[PDB]
Design a protein around this ligand. Structure first.
Ligand SMILES: [Cl-]
Ligand SMILES: [Cl-]
Ligand SMILES: [Cl-]
Ligand SMILES: [Cl-]
Ligand SMILES: [Cl-]
Ligand SMILES: [Mn+2]
Ligand SMILES: [Mn+2]
Ligand SMILES: [Mn+2]
Ligand SMILES: [Mn+2]
Ligand SMILES: [Mn+2]
Ligand SMILES: [Mn+2]
Ligand SMILES: [Mn+2]
Ligand SMILES: [Mn+2]
Ligand SMILES: [Mn+2]
Ligand SMILES: [Mn+2]
Ligand SMILES: [Mn+2]
Ligand SMILES: [Mn+2]
Ligand SMILES: [Mn+2]
Ligand SMILES: [Mn+2]
Ligand SMILES: [Mn+2]
Ligand SMILES: [Mn+2]
Ligand SMILES: [Mn+2]
Ligand SMILES: [Mn+2]
Ligand SMILES: [Mn+2]
Lengths: 79, 99, 98, 106, 87, 99, 94, 109
DNA sequence: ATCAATATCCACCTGCAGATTCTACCAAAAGTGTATTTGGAAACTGCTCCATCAAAAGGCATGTTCAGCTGAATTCAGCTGAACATGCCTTTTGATGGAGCAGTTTCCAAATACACTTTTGGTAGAATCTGCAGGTGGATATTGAT
DNA sequence: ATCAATATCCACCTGCAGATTCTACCAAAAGTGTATTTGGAAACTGCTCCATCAAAAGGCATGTTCAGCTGAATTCAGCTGAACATGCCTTTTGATGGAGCAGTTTCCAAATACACTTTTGGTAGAATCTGCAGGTGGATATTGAT
């Protein structure tokens, strides 16, 4: 499974940047579930932008538009 | 003396029609109708807007049934979108058969 | 043999990664991950490298702020250790759940 | 010989008006002929799905007439409508009955 | 030519038992004594943000009356959509 | 002889009472008074459509009833039954509001 | 397939405020996204304003109200100022 | 005939008054755009760019950098009460977070 | 708090590759100049809809007393999660080759935009219909004390 | 396990307010016919993007130890909830005066519409420069012991 590729030391760095000092063991599987969910919502919308344009490549703008729909605006790849 | 007059437009008559189709015996209060009217106008804007984006995104001057459909896929939870995409396609083919 | 007290490396690690701005999930398992998920939607989809880089930026920020939020919830319950129930509460209050 | 487009598409919703509203709201320079039809259908399907559950909610509270409480119950108890309307307030709707278990005696 | 009474301190009109009724609908069983001033603080901020925009819509329309639609438009900007008043 | 409900019992009855209902919970003249005071600090000599104060009241009460759900989860997360300002504060910040 | 950014205009504004300082390419694209972002926020609100009042035209008056609605208090105030400064100087030239 | 002078120049702006006019037109925001609208808008846009780059630049000099990088943008925006709210739901690629450690987590001594 | 002892960070320097800034062009926007439609500010003006005021009722906010129970504090053990060294392995990174595409250009059938002229669906009051708000009283549950 | 005290349910009635049905003008679809776009269907590129391959490198999985954190158990002071008297002030309802929506007309200041004519933004090699990978060498923090 590829979700398990998102490893414990990576999830712990994110937590360190997010300012967490101590981390419970059940967190990493919890985190993967949430990351999983996030990626789906965003990609579902992005591919839907792709299919509409009759393209086969997902563009940066496709992800930017999806992220805007989801209320999470991203700067630096088009707006 | 002379007199002046006005006119408002809502989805009330349609909402009532659809109400009678599903619950023939049931009625609807004004506040409830007004809420329903608010709902149509809202969904109408969300879809029209997203459709407008899709068109502008692909350097298109025209909103077609297809922009509407994709918009619907983006705004509705699956199985509300699955049914909606279905009902709408039924209407366009029926509309195209009798010209 | 020399040993730092538990918590001392952590406060050091927090400082490192807040002072910095690099991506924190390593790029290939992630790129790999994004590609699996997408084909739950279509096949022979293709990805601009910048598109996967965009998704990765979107993810880490999301998770980092959720982690800020989870952390407040943990401290609120007079703990220093975040747990699943903290992530649960933070996502509920945000509106992503229940 | 006149034949309303709503009739042609088998809809209650006014395909004609929905056409007018897409135009005078400036969403694009031109509007395709199928767009108001598809849209009027989706509007009609969604008001149908909601009124269905709200009618069910009025009968279970022995009422003939739908009131905003029945809209609110129908909406917040349906997983997908609740998502669609997650940031919507229904005037006079109330909340769903819910007491955290931690709060009950026993 | 004539005047009204000065409107001042009306946030205190939002009484404690009302704040207690709202929390009950919100599922609160027990309330700290300090809650009531906090709520008033939060309510006031809310109302200002919402009304400011509502009035801005009024100034723009060159009106002197705030309408329900002004308030509904304000509420939409602010991300809290309201159904049932022109919604 | 005199009868007394143990503390919490009347609270639980009230929670049930008011969750079953949909009436406005703030009294209507003091709320109106509050709104006219605030609005008059942005612009003077305004008037209000009735539906506008009622819209504002519905919106407010909805906002607070819901903040209280979120506040209530926060007290509980901290193994308490009593809501306090820090619970509202925590809730408002996670939500994305402030001060 | 010609593109378009606000880069040269941002570079121009950058050099007016700090002559000595430059901007990385990634930073520039972030700014380009910012300008594009706010532009849409203001235009939309202006479109909304016009339609609400049954108006066909977006005027500086619409931008100004829109700017009021979208910008935080002290930032609305300076922006509203700067924009009027820009229209007046534009009318000056006859 | 006569001698051309760009609307940006007439308004004393660096930002493209002409381009902002075209974009308002081709975005379908209204049937018509007044001549004052793009001027006003372009000014407003320029001003916000100035305010960000001002503060983002001050931060680059404090890291001894000639070049503004996203970190300085992120520093500038998230440290200014108002810019931070305007951009409250915006992610800045390669920005990082503001250094902040919740005090409870620091040692007692 | 000093003392000593690892361990880790973090400023002062420094040549070089990967980027930024600089040069030299051009199609495509932007600007001008002239001729015309036209949206919307102004000037009324009819008339809803709002602002007060007030009387009279009786619903609730208030203030007070008092004890149940909650929150805060302490203490403590067991068990979880941090730190660390070791060692294997996944990830980076660095070109290469070739196909599967998005991006253009250009051509016409097909679709949409308009303007009038009917023709009908939708709306505003007016005239009927009618749930159910509000006010009850008896049962059925619930709570808390002997 | 019973009882007294409460509160909540839940069905019965009925004029009346609020919802439905109905009427008749008329605004706005619909139908026609002419005038414009436009989004393709085929034909062509250059260019990103996959698909591999294989070094070397940090970075990750492991397992053991033990610090110290989370949660449990107890204790207690004081705060908040329940209960009740009292009387203020909200709620209703109603009449009236009057501002100011909103409906209309008429007319320019302002926008749109071509036709041309510069001028600029974008683009692509060539020509400078700033971080950056690294290296210290030194300070700065930290831990266990007196
Ligand atoms: Cl989400
Ligand atoms: Cl002409
Ligand atoms: Cl306790
Ligand atoms: Cl070395
Ligand atoms: Cl000693
Ligand atoms: Mn049915
Ligand atoms: Mn009693
Ligand atoms: Mn203008
Ligand atoms: Mn080089
Ligand atoms: Mn003419
Ligand atoms: Mn006119
Ligand atoms: Mn007493
Ligand atoms: Mn006691
Ligand atoms: Mn121990
Ligand atoms: Mn008819
Ligand atoms: Mn009843
Ligand atoms: Mn009547
Ligand atoms: Mn080797
Ligand atoms: Mn009193
Ligand atoms: Mn040039
Ligand atoms: Mn140039
Ligand atoms: Mn360096
Ligand atoms: Mn280095
Ligand atoms: Mn010793």
């Amino acid at each position: 499974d590829n979700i398990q590729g998102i490893t414990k030391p990576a999830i712990r760095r994110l937590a360190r940047r997010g300012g967490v000092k101590r981390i419970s063991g059940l967190i990493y599987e919890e985190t993967r579930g949430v990351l999983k969910v996030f990626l789906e919502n965003v990609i579902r919308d992005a591919v839907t932008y792709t299919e509409h344009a009759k393209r086969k490549t997902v563009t940066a703008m496709d992800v930017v538009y999806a992220l805007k729909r989801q209320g999470r605006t991203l700067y630096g790849f088009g707006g | 003396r002379k007199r002046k007059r006005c006119r408002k437009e809502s989805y009330s008559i349609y909402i009532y029609k659809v109400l009678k189709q599903v619950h023939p015996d049931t009625g609807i209060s004004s506040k409830a109708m007004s809420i329903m009217n608010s709902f149509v106008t809202d969904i109408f804007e969300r879809i029209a807007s997203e459709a407008s984006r899709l068109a502008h995104y692909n350097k298109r001057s025209t909103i077609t049934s297809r922009e509407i459909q994709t918009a619907v896929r983006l705004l509705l939870p699956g199985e509300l979108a699955k049914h909606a995409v279905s009902e709408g396609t039924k209407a366009v083919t029926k509309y195209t058969s009798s010209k | 043999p020399h040993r730092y007290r538990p918590g001392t490396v952590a406060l050091r690690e927090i400082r490192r990664y807040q002072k910095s701005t690099e991506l924190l999930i390593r790029k290939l398992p992630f790129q790999r991950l994004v590609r699996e998920i997408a084909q739950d939607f279509k096949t022979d989809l293709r990805f601009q490298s910048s598109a996967v880089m965009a998704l990765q930026e979107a993810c880490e920020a999301y998770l980092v702020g959720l982690f800020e939020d989870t952390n407040l919830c943990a401290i609120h319950a007079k703990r220093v250790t975040i747990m699943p129930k903290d992530i649960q509460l933070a996502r509920r209050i945000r509106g992503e759940r229940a | 010989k006149a034949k309303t487009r709503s009739s042609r598409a088998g809809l209650q919703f006014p395909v004609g008006r929905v056409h007018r509203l897409l135009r005078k709201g400036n969403y694009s320079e031109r509007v395709g002929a199928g767009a108001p039809v598809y849209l009027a259908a989706v509007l009609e399907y969604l008001t149908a799905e909601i009124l269905e559950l709200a009618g069910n909610a009025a009968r279970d509270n022995k009422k003939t007439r739908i009131i905003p409480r029945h809209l609110q119950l129908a909406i917040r108890n349906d997983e997908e409508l609740n998502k669609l309307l997650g940031r919507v307030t229904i005037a006079q709707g109330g909340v769903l009955p819910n007491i955290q278990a931690v709060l009950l005696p026993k």
